Ligand binder design. Structure first.
Ligand SMILES: [Cl-]
Ligand SMILES: [Cl-]
Ligand code: NA
Length: 129
């Protein structure tokens, strides 16, 4: 599914991501925008051969299982394929474990280089939340 910007903010909020670990909702929407262009089916191979899946481009080296990333972990205990679903539940629950891991949202390269320190509230501006 390709979410609409406010439609994504709403699902994120309903799923408890707004100010999760101190990150306002706009930070999450901004990250999804640059990681996946709000597309739950987005997949991108990384240099190390691991792959990033879903709206929040969660990586197979540590978080989900895809059967083709040697030496990797599956810390969210789920098939990477479940991160491509129309329903973002699995991706949110997993993003919550990632962001609690110590480096906060800096775990998302796109958030650090394109959202961090920018006007992220702009991403939820105009949305009925
Ligand atoms: Cl694997
Ligand atoms: Cl933090
Ligand atoms: Na894995």
């Amino acid at each position: 599914k390709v979410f609409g910007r406010c439609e994504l903010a709403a699902a994120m909020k309903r799923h408890g991501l707004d100010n999760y670990r101190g990150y306002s909702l706009g930070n999450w929407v901004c990250a999804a925008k640059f990681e996946s262009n709000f597309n739950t089916q987005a997949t991108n191979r990384n240099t190390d051969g691991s792959t990033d899946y879903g709206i929040l481009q969660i990586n197979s080296r540590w978080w989900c299982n895809d059967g083709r990333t040697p030496g990797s972990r599956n810390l969210c205990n789920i098939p990477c394929s479940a991160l491509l679903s129309s329903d973002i539940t699995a991706s949110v629950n997993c993003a919550k474990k990632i962001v609690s891991d110590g480096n906060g949202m800096n775990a998302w390269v796109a958030w650090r280089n394109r959202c961090k320190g920018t006007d992220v509230q702009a991403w939820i501006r105009g949305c009925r939340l």
